[PDB]
Amino acid sequence: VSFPASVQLHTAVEMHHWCIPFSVDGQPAPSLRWLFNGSVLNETSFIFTEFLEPAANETVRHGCLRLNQPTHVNNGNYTLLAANPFGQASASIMAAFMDNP
Amino acid sequence: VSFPASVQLHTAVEMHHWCIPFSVDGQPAPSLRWLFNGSVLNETSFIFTEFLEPAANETVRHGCLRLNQPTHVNNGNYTLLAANPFGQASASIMAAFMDNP
Amino acid sequence: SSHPIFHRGEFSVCDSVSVWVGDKTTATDIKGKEVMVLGEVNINNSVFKQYFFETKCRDGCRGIDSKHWNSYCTTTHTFVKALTMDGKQAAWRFIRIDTACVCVLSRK
Amino acid sequence: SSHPIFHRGEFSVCDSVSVWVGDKTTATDIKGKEVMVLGEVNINNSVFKQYFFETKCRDGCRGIDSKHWNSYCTTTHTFVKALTMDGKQAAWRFIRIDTACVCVLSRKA
């Protein structure tokens, strides 16, 4: 049985790298897309999306927008867009990794 | 039993900090002083002498001249001077911490 | 909230914190000498207020085998160029600034 | 190697090496963009050869409880001002450079 995408973001946290935790559901599995301050965020080797290993018997996926030492220039509103054939689910969060004189 | 000072230095080794290991004996115990390229080396918070804990019944002391992140400007001949009533013992060693520009 | 990442993510053995330092006035040079840091500098034009990127230990280490090792976190440094007053004249010199936070091992 | 310090000394969890880097041509700026790094710079009429102090892993970490943790050492960075190039724009921008080697912790099972 196929169902629409669902999405949620969690407040950014600093581990080895900074991470904006996300959880997404849907089947077909939605395609992820990020926006920084409303405009598309191009992933690079320093800012990229990362999924954890899939759990048995579940369609729900967990992961992080991973930021390798971001600076005040990465402070802003992060939107995760999850899309599949039913439409799109969206979740946003404000993140501050550094002040900025 | 009183006896003249004896002293030796070992090849510099990089651990957490760099270290020029030394072993010194003598009774009375000798006062220590270091030279860098023949001139007095004044210890700082980044370059100083550190003694390991004295072992059971033995007058010999071990330790290091500890160098906290030394550069090529610290490359040179290090001399340890151990002095007591009998006179003084000396030992020198060349240390390179980094190639220069 | 409870997110799988708090358990399955990659953590640091030592926690740090990065900040931008623009009120630095003294620092030690590569000769270990204490030197004065210019608040500003200027490239064949206007002035760039001198700022520095620093990372130090955030207020033993994580994941250490405490049966054989003692441990502690500590701030290490790096050498960065800067407009300084050598105690005589203005010069471009390498100064020591905080740059990371690492774990130190010591046997038990 | 019989010196007590080889046993009672303070050790690194991860081993690094420090060098002066002077042949750096490219780098990535604070915005993550690949920019050009010049080899000299003019600081107040004084021509300077651009050099950088860099520390990187000496290529699991030491002292880790391997029963409970996967781990490895990795090179972390710092941002430092440098004369770079983006078009006909020589600029004073912050770039990413190696500054330390840290231990990355990871639970297993």
From Swiss-Prot, chains A, B:
It comes from the Eukaryota. Induction: Isoform TrkA-III is up-regulated upon hypoxia in cells normally expressing it. It is found in: Cell membrane; Early endosome membrane; Late endosome membrane; Recycling endosome membrane. Isoform TrkA-I is found in most non-neuronal tissues. Isoform TrkA-II is primarily expressed in neuronal cells. TrkA-III is specifically expressed by pluripotent neural stem and neural crest progenitors. Residues 18-84 form the Ig-like C2-type domain. Glycans are attached at N37, N42, N57, N77. Ligand-mediated autophosphorylation. Interaction with SQSTM1 is phosphotyrosine-dependent. N-glycosylated. Isoform TrkA-I and isoform TrkA-II are N-glycosylated. Disulfide bonds join C19-C64. It is linked to Congenital insensitivity to pain with anhidrosis: Characterized by a congenital insensitivity to pain, anhidrosis (absence of sweating), absence of reaction to noxious stimuli, self-mutilating behavior, and intellectual disability. This rare autosomal recessive disorder is also known as congenital sensory neuropathy with anhidrosis or hereditary sensory and autonomic neuropathy type IV or familial dysautonomia type II. Chromosomal aberrations involving NTRK1 are found in papillary thyroid carcinomas (PTCs). Translocation t(1;3)(q21;q11) with TFG generates the TRKT3 (TRK-T3) transcript by fusing TFG to the 3'-end of NTRK1. A rearrangement with TPM3 generates the TRK transcript by fusing TPM3 to the 3'-end of NTRK1. An intrachromosomal rearrangement that links the protein kinase domain of NTRK1 to the 5'-end of the TPR gene forms the fusion protein TRK-T1. TRK-T1 is a 55 kDa protein reacting with antibodies against the C-terminus of the NTRK1 protein. Belongs to the protein kinase superfamily. Tyr protein kinase family. Insulin receptor subfamily. Trk also stands for tropomyosin-related kinase since it was first isolated as an oncogenic protein which was the result of a fusion between the tropomyosin gene TPM3 and NTRK1. Receptor tyrosine kinase involved in the development and the maturation of the central and peripheral nervous systems through regulation of proliferation, differentiation and survival of sympathetic and nervous neurons. High affinity receptor for NGF which is its primary ligand. Can also bind and be activated by NTF3/neurotrophin-3. However, NTF3 only supports axonal extension through NTRK1 but has no effect on neuron survival. Upon dimeric NGF ligand-binding, undergoes homodimerization, autophosphorylation and activation. This is High affinity nerve growth factor receptor. The lineage of its organism: Eukaryota, Metazoa, Chordata, Craniata, Vertebrata. The gene is NTRK1. The chain holds residues 282 to 382 of 796 of the full protein.
From Swiss-Prot, chain D:
A 1-acyl-sn-glycero-3-phospho-(1D-myo-inositol) binds at Y51, K81. Disulfide bonds join C14-C73, C57-C101, C61-C103. It comes from the Eukaryota. It is found in: Secreted; Endosome lumen. A 1-acyl-sn-glycero-3-phospho-L-serine binds at K81. Belongs to the NGF-beta family. It is linked to Neuropathy, hereditary sensory and autonomic, 5: A form of hereditary sensory and autonomic neuropathy, a genetically and clinically heterogeneous group of disorders characterized by degeneration of dorsal root and autonomic ganglion cells, and by sensory and/or autonomic abnormalities. HSAN5 patients manifest loss of pain perception and impaired temperature sensitivity, ulcers, and in some cases self-mutilation. The autonomic involvement is variable. Nerve growth factor is important for the development and maintenance of the sympathetic and sensory nervous systems. Extracellular ligand for the NTRK1 and NGFR receptors, activates cellular signaling cascades to regulate neuronal proliferation, differentiation and survival. The immature NGF precursor (proNGF) functions as a ligand for the heterodimeric receptor formed by SORCS2 and NGFR, and activates cellular signaling cascades that lead to inactivation of RAC1 and/or RAC2, reorganization of the actin cytoskeleton and neuronal growth cone collapse. Homodimer. The homodimer interacts with a single NTRK1 chain. The homodimer interacts with a single NGFR chain. The NGF dimer interacts with a single SORCS2 chain (via extracellular domain). The NGF precursor (proNGF) binds to a receptor complex formed by SORT1 and NGFR, which leads to NGF endocytosis. Both mature NGF and the immature NGF precursor (proNGF) interact with SORCS2 and with the heterodimer formed by SORCS2 and NGFR (via extracellular domains). The NGF precursor (proNGF) has much higher affinity for SORCS2 than mature NGF. This is Beta-nerve growth factor.
